Amino acid sequence: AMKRKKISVIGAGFTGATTAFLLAQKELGDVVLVDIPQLENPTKGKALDMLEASPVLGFDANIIGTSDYADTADSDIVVITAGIRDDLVTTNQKIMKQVTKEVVKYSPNCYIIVLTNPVDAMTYTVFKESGFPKNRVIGQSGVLDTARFRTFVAEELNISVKDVTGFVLGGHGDDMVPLVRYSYAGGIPLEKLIPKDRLDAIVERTRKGGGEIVNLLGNGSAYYAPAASLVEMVEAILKDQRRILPAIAYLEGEYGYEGIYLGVPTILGGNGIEKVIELELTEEEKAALAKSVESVKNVM
Amino acid sequence: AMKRKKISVIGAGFTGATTAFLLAQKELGDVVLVDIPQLENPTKGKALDMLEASPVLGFDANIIGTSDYADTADSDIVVITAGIAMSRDDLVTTNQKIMKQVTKEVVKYSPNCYIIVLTNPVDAMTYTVFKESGFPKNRVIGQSGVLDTARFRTFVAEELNISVKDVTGFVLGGHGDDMVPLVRYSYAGGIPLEKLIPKDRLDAIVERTRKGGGEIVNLLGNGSAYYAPAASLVEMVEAILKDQRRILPAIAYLEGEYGYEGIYLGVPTILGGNGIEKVIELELTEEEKAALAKSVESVK
Amino acid sequence: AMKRKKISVIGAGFTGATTAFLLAQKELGDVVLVDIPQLENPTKGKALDMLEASPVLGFDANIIGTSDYADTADSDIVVITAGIARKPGMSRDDLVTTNQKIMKQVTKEVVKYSPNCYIIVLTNPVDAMTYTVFKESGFPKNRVIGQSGVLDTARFRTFVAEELNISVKDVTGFVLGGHGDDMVPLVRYSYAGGIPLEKLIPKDRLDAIVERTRKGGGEIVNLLGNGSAYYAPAASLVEMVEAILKDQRRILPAIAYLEGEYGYEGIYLGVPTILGGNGIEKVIELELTEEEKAALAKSVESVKNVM
Amino acid sequence: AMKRKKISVIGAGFTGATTAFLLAQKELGDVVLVDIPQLENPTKGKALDMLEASPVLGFDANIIGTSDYADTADSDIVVITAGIARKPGMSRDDLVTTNQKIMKQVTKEVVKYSPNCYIIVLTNPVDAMTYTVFKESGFPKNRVIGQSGVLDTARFRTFVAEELNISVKDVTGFVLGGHGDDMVPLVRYSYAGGIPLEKLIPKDRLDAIVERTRKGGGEIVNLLGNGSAYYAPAASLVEMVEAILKDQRRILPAIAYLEGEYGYEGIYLGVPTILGGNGIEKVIELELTEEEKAALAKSVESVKNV
Numbered sequence A: 001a002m003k004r005k006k007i008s009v010i011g012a013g014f015t016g017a018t019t020a021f022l023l024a025q026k027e028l029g030d031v032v033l034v035d036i037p038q039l040e041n042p043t044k045g046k047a048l049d050m051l052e053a054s055p056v057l058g059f060d061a062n063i064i065g066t067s068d069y070a071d072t073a074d075s076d077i078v079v080i081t082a083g084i085r086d087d088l089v090t091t092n093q094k095i096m097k098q099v100t101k102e103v104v105k106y107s108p109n110c111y112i113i114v115l116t117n118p119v120d121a122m123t124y125t126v127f128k129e130s131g132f133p134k135n136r137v138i139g140q141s142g143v144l145d146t147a148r149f150r151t152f153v154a155e156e157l158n159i160s161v162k163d164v165t166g167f168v169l170g171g172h173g174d175d176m177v178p179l180v181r182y183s184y185a186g187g188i189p190l191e192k193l194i195p196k197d198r199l200d201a202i203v204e205r206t207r208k209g210g211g212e213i214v215n216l217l218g219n220g221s222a223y224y225a226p227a228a229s230l231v232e233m234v235e236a237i238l239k240d241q242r243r244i245l246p247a248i249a250y251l252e253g254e255y256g257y258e259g260i261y262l263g264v265p266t267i268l269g270g271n272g273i274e275k276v277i278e279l280e281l282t283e284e285e286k287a288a289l290a291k292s293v294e295s296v297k298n299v300m
Numbered sequence B: 001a002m003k004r005k006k007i008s009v010i011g012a013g014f015t016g017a018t019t020a021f022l023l024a025q026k027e028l029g030d031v032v033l034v035d036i037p038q039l040e041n042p043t044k045g046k047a048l049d050m051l052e053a054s055p056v057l058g059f060d061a062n063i064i065g066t067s068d069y070a071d072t073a074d075s076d077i078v079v080i081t082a083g084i085a086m087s088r089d090d091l092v093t094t095n096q097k098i099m100k101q102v103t104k105e106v107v108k109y110s111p112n113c114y115i116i117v118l119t120n121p122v123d124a125m126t127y128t129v130f131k132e133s134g135f136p137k138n139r140v141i142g143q144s145g146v147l148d149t150a151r152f153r154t155f156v157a158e159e160l161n162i163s164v165k166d167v168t169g170f171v172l173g174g175h176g177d178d179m180v181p182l183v184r185y186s187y188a189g190g191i192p193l194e195k196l197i198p199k200d201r202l203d204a205i206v207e208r209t210r211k212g213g214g215e216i217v218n219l220l221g222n223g224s225a226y227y228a229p230a231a232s233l234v235e236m237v238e239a240i241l242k243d244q245r246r247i248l249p250a251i252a253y254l255e256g257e258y259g260y261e262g263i264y265l266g267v268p269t270i271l272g273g274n275g276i277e278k279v280i281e282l283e284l285t286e287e288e289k290a291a292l293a294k295s296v297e298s299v300k
Numbered sequence C: 001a002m003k004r005k006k007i008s009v010i011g012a013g014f015t016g017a018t019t020a021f022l023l024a025q026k027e028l029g030d031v032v033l034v035d036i037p038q039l040e041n042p043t044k045g046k047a048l049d050m051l052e053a054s055p056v057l058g059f060d061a062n063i064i065g066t067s068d069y070a071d072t073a074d075s076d077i078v079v080i081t082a083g084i085a086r087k088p089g090m091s092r093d094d095l096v097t098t099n100q101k102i103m104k105q106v107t108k109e110v111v112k113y114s115p116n117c118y119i120i121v122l123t124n125p126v127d128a129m130t131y132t133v134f135k136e137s138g139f140p141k142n143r144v145i146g147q148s149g150v151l152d153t154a155r156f157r158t159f160v161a162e163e164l165n166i167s168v169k170d171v172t173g174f175v176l177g178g179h180g181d182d183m184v185p186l187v188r189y190s191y192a193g194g195i196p197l198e199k200l201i202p203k204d205r206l207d208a209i210v211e212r213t214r215k216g217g218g219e220i221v222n223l224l225g226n227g228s229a230y231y232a233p234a235a236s237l238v239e240m241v242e243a244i245l246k247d248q249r250r251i252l253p254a255i256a257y258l259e260g261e262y263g264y265e266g267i268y269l270g271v272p273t274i275l276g277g278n279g280i281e282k283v284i285e286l287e288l289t290e291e292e293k294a295a296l297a298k299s300v301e302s303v304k305n306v307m
Numbered sequence D: 001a002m003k004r005k006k007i008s009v010i011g012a013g014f015t016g017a018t019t020a021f022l023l024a025q026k027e028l029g030d031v032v033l034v035d036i037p038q039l040e041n042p043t044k045g046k047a048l049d050m051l052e053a054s055p056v057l058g059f060d061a062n063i064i065g066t067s068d069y070a071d072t073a074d075s076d077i078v079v080i081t082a083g084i085a086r087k088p089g090m091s092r093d094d095l096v097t098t099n100q101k102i103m104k105q106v107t108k109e110v111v112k113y114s115p116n117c118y119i120i121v122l123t124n125p126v127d128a129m130t131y132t133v134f135k136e137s138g139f140p141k142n143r144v145i146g147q148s149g150v151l152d153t154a155r156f157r158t159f160v161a162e163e164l165n166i167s168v169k170d171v172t173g174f175v176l177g178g179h180g181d182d183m184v185p186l187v188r189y190s191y192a193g194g195i196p197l198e199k200l201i202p203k204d205r206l207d208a209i210v211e212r213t214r215k216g217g218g219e220i221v222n223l224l225g226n227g228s229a230y231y232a233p234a235a236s237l238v239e240m241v242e243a244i245l246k247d248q249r250r251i252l253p254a255i256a257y258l259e260g261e262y263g264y265e266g267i268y269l270g271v272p273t274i275l276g277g278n279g280i281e282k283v284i285e286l287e288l289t290e291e292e293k294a295a296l297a298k299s300v301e302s303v304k305n306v
């Protein structure tokens, strides 16, 4: 029988909830929205509120809220947005291990997309607790950074964001390794369209993208763009699209590094990470990536 | 020259934010997201988060947060979510002045717009906006029945295990005990629900629709519903921006219809290019006629 | 190992090519467009043309054209649009004789390479042709389904939308039985915004609307001069394919095998169904008037000649 | 009153009908299919067939068929897909002559009933057909545009995606000038997820992809036996229509009137443009290698000699 895909969203906060509503509107499958027992009810009300939109927007998806991982059984994809500095890492690292053990009990065959910061190490933890091969455990970072990058380049030139491309290796902030030489408008290199000063500010504003939103909102981090980035990565897997997207992936040789997670260009498909793509980098880029890999080792 | 539609959403909270993002997703137009000067930053931060999701989801729309009503200039549509956050006469009276204040800058900066009001009690608020605006009846509308039908349809769909797409609901009047549902004009794929769902189980679905708001409030712990209410507003914006001539329930101004006059009541409407194109009058029975009188009398 | 749904469309004529392009645009799966060997090159031309549209419309679907049924192996759904139209002056029996044969030859190769698929049949007359597919396939009944009422209700909703000047989204039609004289409309289960149409449209013009619905297929044939309708038919097939692939449990009129329903046994009839992941989940049994039971008994007399 | 956008599609054939159906499905506006008086019943038949799909696919649109240009009044956009039925003994030069005459007759009737429209031309040869539409219309240059480059880039992107086994969403092509031998691809400005294709695909296979792109229209003609491509050309048209009606400011290749751009004056040429609510907002001018200037110079010597 034809069965709907099943997506469990672990963490029913701003990000997990926006992600669930997006997945449901796109009819990508049934969504189980999961939080802690003391937020069980709020999670049931967000779910039921999303579901009550379905007649009007006109989508067929079941959306339920729960604190019982038995309800995530035989999930196809699990999105870990479950969050609460070296103490924070150790708290989130404790969560990741509690969550992952429940997840792979009930869904031994699922694919895991991790949003939890620092996503470099939060994913490594999932990967090691899960016991799953590296293709099945992925983290989000590069898509959000390229999303902010394209938005700034788009207002600068007064053109559709659809015709802007960014390229990002590494993590957020100072871990971020932009390749503005692989960044284009209409396929024209940006370095030919934006004077040096205005362009390096757009690169800086991308580095300070996540904080610019944390500053404006006052309480909590971004959720709209981050939810979009997870959905693009979910869609790439469920629909076996073989998208080329930057993701947090486990290296076993690529770019010289081994045994770590890092933001690299991948092919996202029905087998999860089909390939980590190896580019020829400049010495300036390899050096900026070596510094980034030093802050990934910094969170052991 | 072809110009985008401009939509301004007054109230950048839970409901207006969700409304703005849905409108942008569907490329219905440009969105200005409007709150009060002390919240101008977290508003600009929601608007920018949303706009940053545009590259990832593939929509061309601009979204700006403001506290300056000059930015809402030449709006095609204004949507009022401006809500207060205390007696039952306190919220009404406070919301009434908000409505007045908001409508005043709106009809100065966008003289020719259409207005859709969500702020509860919508029958009272929509009246205020209508009075302060000096616009004809067709150009000022509240949201209520779409959200009630959406709840009804969700519960019927679960009861029958069928798609929400093939469930109809029919409601006059407003929320709570002011709701006048006609189950006899409600169907699963054109089949009346009286013939498909027993008397007892159909009575409880209707009671659950009366208490639908409250059920989310209770589960949410703090604050009311937004996903389904945002969805309900976008359906009404779409019917107007695209001149669809939908038959939708809407809070409209009566002048002979159902025997009442000089009130805003939940009625079936043709919603099109001229907002309310016609108020539809059915042949009501006495137990429904009386139920509407008790609904008219409860809106005072 | 998340893999695309695979949909095979049999017949690369206007209805099958239109269907293929809609399925690919909606990313419902990978599409295999099949036709006879002599039309192999045209079939690949159409498929490659549709596929070259994918970067522009921004869908990820494979489309291929073939005359090799091995290319349809392990289809989740197979849509049959192969067969001839009833030419003016052609007898109904000649239409059935020719299409009966194509349905046996097509089903043979379909089930040879996709023993587990769902089958949706467009070929006319659809109760007779869906029955032939069922009996040839050896499939259980929930897996072999014909299109009829969706297309009849689509034309009905279009005419009524025009008469009342409202969106088609807010019109409901309701039809049992087949096309033409075989259609059994329930105007009393037909509404505008849930208001009965008998209360809104006077008797003469509503009767005209019902009669135009019966004649709708012939109206497009008369206007085209060269063949039959394809856009609305293709749309109707895609709505049924979606209901199944995405397990939607839609309530849709379908041509379904009855085993007691409506008091008929061992026939395909046009009835309200719930459509989902297991195909026909349920035939919905209605209480009909005696006029309705009679019109349905005349409609039945045309799959009885195929039993 | 909020009013629907209105689109007239001149020629209700394979490309015209395919385009009309995509425009209605997407809800970009009401659609008027126009053809010759003898083909008015076929045109109403397609229009009515499409409209009867609306309740099933869930779109609200008016679609009609006509032989009468009054039904096209106050169109926001006219798409020209009109061209003469290729008879057996039709001279290449006879065909271009007939079509040149169709463009003038069509354009005179269009600008009388829609003096404010934006016009997109598909009819081959599109550089010469679009110039003929421009000069008959009396409109300024930003409001008469040709389709060519989008279709070539669609075919290129399809073949690169096949070659690398990746999504077509993540492949980009760059093409100046016309179809076939007149095409000037810039593979150096062509990528897979931002990566130059020259680093991904060996030169012999990438040369062959380019050659398949030049030949891509004829590849479909050969397989079909009668007639030419219609699904990708319709899609290509609709992307350009959508970039105008929704003021998107897309960067797309279009057959655009040049007054100095690339050092040419008073010609239509395939060039990267910005496409928005005022039609062609900007012709984009690239720094070309002497080889690319020379390939383009040779491409312009085609546009003048037809």
Ligand SMILES: NC(=O)c1ccc[n+]([C@@H]2O[C@H](COP(=O)([O-])OP(=O)(O)OC[C@H]3O[C@@H](n4cnc5c(N)ncnc54)[C@H](O)[C@@H]3O)[C@@H](O)[C@H]2O)c1
Residues within 6 Å of the ligand: A010, A011, A012, A013, A014, A015, A016, A034, A035, A036, A039, A081, A082, A083, A084, A095, A098, A099, A114, A115, A116, A117, A119, A140, A141, A144, A172, A220, A221, A222, A223, A226
């Ligand atoms: N990858 C990125 O670029 C990116 C961007 C934005 C957000 N983030 C990160 O995503 C995380 C969540 O963001 P948010 O705004 O949605 O946060 P939030 O605090 O609003 O929501 C987090 C949720 O996690 C839940 N949770 C905690 N422990 C749990 C457990 N054991 N089981 C189940 N649920 C549990 C909480 O109940 C809470 O509702 C944060 O770590 C944030 O920094 C990363």
Ligand SMILES: NC(=O)c1ccc[n+]([C@@H]2O[C@H](COP(=O)([O-])OP(=O)(O)OC[C@H]3O[C@@H](n4cnc5c(N)ncnc54)[C@H](O)[C@@H]3O)[C@@H](O)[C@H]2O)c1
Residues within 6 Å of the ligand: B010, B011, B012, B013, B014, B015, B016, B034, B035, B036, B039, B081, B082, B083, B084, B085, B098, B099, B101, B102, B118, B119, B120, B122, B143, B144, B147, B175, B213, B223, B224, B225, B226, B229
């Ligand atoms: N029709 C329905 O059934 C329905 C459903 C849910 C919400 N609502 C109503 O809609 C309103 C908004 O609800 P919410 O959940 O978005 O609440 P919210 O408090 O999150 O949003 C209200 C926002 O309005 C802003 N605001 C107040 N006065 C303003 C003014 N004069 N100008 C501009 N902004 C102003 C506030 O600062 C706040 O951000 C409330 O009245 C709520 O009860 C109606």
Ligand SMILES: NC(=O)c1ccc[n+]([C@@H]2O[C@H](COP(=O)([O-])OP(=O)(O)OC[C@H]3O[C@@H](n4cnc5c(N)ncnc54)[C@H](O)[C@@H]3O)[C@@H](O)[C@H]2O)c1
Residues within 6 Å of the ligand: C010, C011, C012, C013, C014, C015, C016, C034, C035, C036, C039, C081, C082, C083, C084, C085, C102, C105, C106, C122, C123, C124, C125, C126, C147, C148, C151, C179, C217, C227, C228, C229, C230, C233
């Ligand atoms: N329910 C309705 O009202 C409705 C609507 C329109 C068409 N139809 C049915 O659909 C059929 C096709 O419609 P169309 O407009 O595409 O006609 P068409 O003539 O364009 O298409 C029929 C195709 O079937 C192919 N075919 C024949 N035998 C075959 C075989 N053994 N294997 C594979 N392909 C084979 C033909 O080569 C042709 O390409 C009609 O004959 C009719 O029975 C039903």
Ligand SMILES: NC(=O)c1ccc[n+]([C@@H]2O[C@H](COP(=O)([O-])OP(=O)(O)OC[C@H]3O[C@@H](n4cnc5c(N)ncnc54)[C@H](O)[C@@H]3O)[C@@H](O)[C@H]2O)c1
Residues within 6 Å of the ligand: D010, D011, D012, D013, D014, D015, D016, D034, D035, D036, D039, D081, D082, D083, D084, D085, D102, D105, D106, D121, D122, D123, D124, D126, D147, D148, D151, D227, D228, D229, D230, D233
């Ligand atoms: N890249 C491109 O720009 C591109 C690609 C493919 C098609 N084309 C061209 O598009 C044109 C249409 O191709 P098609 O396959 O749709 O052809 P078609 O023969 O199917 O349709 C052309 C239609 O134009 C109609 N027509 C003829 N004269 C007319 C007039 N005076 N007024 C109105 N309508 C008139 C015809 O009756 C016919 O129905 C051809 O010139 C073709 O070469 C160009």
